[PDB]
Each structure stands twice: as C-alpha cells, then as structure tokens.
C-alpha cells in the first residue's frame, strides 16, 4: 500500500497557504474537496530514494480568518506546516497560537515552520526575530510560494522525520508551476547565511 501522511497546513489568512500548496501541479489536478469541513486535500507525491511518499495536504477555504479551526480539520494529522508571512509581523505573532491549537489536538507530531513571501524586497520578519521553532523540535525554512523557492525543504524534513531515515533524499523535484516571480540568488544566499548565523546565538 502507498505510503502517505495527512499534513495540515495552518497559519493566518493571507500568508500564502493556498498559493504554496498549489505549486504542486499533480497535487492540484488530483485535489479532493471536502464540503463538510470546507477543505481541499492535495495529494502531493514525492519520489524518494526509498520509493514514493504522498503528503495529503489539508488546505482551508479561508475560515481561519474568523476563528480557530474545528477538530475534524486537525484530526489524525501526522505532520504539519505552520505558515506566516515575513511581510506581516502579526502573522508571526500568531504562530504560538497555531502551535497551541495544533498540539492540543495532535500532540508531538513533526512540525515545520515556514516564513513565506521572502521574494518580496522589503522584508519585515528577519532571521534574528524568528525564534519560536528553536524550542520544540520545530524546523524552520524561509520559502517563497510564488517562486518555488525552497518548496521541497519542509517536505523533505518531514519525510526524514516520519520514515526515521536521516539519509532519505528526493530523487527528483516534483513538476511545479513555473515561478511567477524570481528569487534573487543573492537574497537567497544572504537569507540562508542569516539563518545559520542566527542559529548560533
């Protein structure tokens, strides 16, 4: 039977959750609408050195703007991605709230913290301010949904955590929507170095 995990994708409205999950073309063409919960589940296959693994990513239909999400959304999640927007400081301010909501219902599942929109010139939530992950087996990645930047990173970290294999690799990138903006190789380099510099503090 196919190896697959429910992944819940939470975070403030407007952080780019829908834009992000949709980069994965087959996940978008094969997505399933769940009316009872107002959710779309995107089946995201990744081909690893040990075979295919499927992340069934649960994307909201906007309800997160009006309150916490219901239990049935979280139920049986095996991993999660928490997203904020590095152009909106309040979205990062809400991260602990999502974590709390998530852990209340799912326990100690593998979780990755993502700061989306790093393609945008005037960044507000920089490396040195990003601290929530350090404390709780939370890995962090900068991402840019619109540019596909670091798209595979959260998925690879979760794969390695769920399978229990540190040496797991993706043999090939999934077919993704072509970037709508360009991620400056220099910014990527500086933001990447900024995170390592910070991780030593």
């Amino acid at each position: 039977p196919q190896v697959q995990f429910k992944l819940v994708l939470v975070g403030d409205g407007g952080t780019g959750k829908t834009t992000f999950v949709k980069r994965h073309l087959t996940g978008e063409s094969e997505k399933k609408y769940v009316a009872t919960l107002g959710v779309e589940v995107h089946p995201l296959v990744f081909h690893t050195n040990r075979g295919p693994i499927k992340f069934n990513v649960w994307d909201t239909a906007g309800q997160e703007k009006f309150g916490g999400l219901r239990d049935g959304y979280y139920i049986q999640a095996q991993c999660a991605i928490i997203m904020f927007d590095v152009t909106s400081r309040v979205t990062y301010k809400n991260v602990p709230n999502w974590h709390r909501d998530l852990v209340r219902v799912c326990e100690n599942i593998p979780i990755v913290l993502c700061g989306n929109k790093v393609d945008i010139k005037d960044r507000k939530v920089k490396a040195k301010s990003i601290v929530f992950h350090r404390k709780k087996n939370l890995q962090y990645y900068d991402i840019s949904a619109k540019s596909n930047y670091n798209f595979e990173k959260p998925f690879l970290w979760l794969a390695r955590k769920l399978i229990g294999d540190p040496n797991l690799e993706f043999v090939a990138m999934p077919a993704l929507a072509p970037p709508e903006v360009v991620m400056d190789p220099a910014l990527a380099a500086q933001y990447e170095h900024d995170l390592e510099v910070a991780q030593t503090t």
């Binding site: 697959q4 429910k6 399933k32 769940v34 009872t36 919960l37 959710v39 589940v41 089946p43 069934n56 649960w58 049935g72 959304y73 139920i75 049986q76």
Partner: peptide, 27 residues
C-alpha cells in the same frame, strides 16, 4: 483491517461507520 476515506483520504479503523474526520459514511 482499517480503511481509507474516499472523501478526505483519512485512514479509519475497521470498526468506524463514518469517517472520524469528515463524517463521510463508509462505502
């Protein structure tokens, strides 16, 4: 043996009548 929900893809244990997640009945 457990079963996959055709609506939301969640795995339910063989006993359940409807999906513990989306309340969708078992085929």
């Amino acid at each position: 043996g457990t079963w996959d929900c055709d609506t939301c893809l969640v795995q339910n244990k063989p006993e359940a009548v409807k999906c513990v997640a989306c309340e969708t009945p078992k085929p």
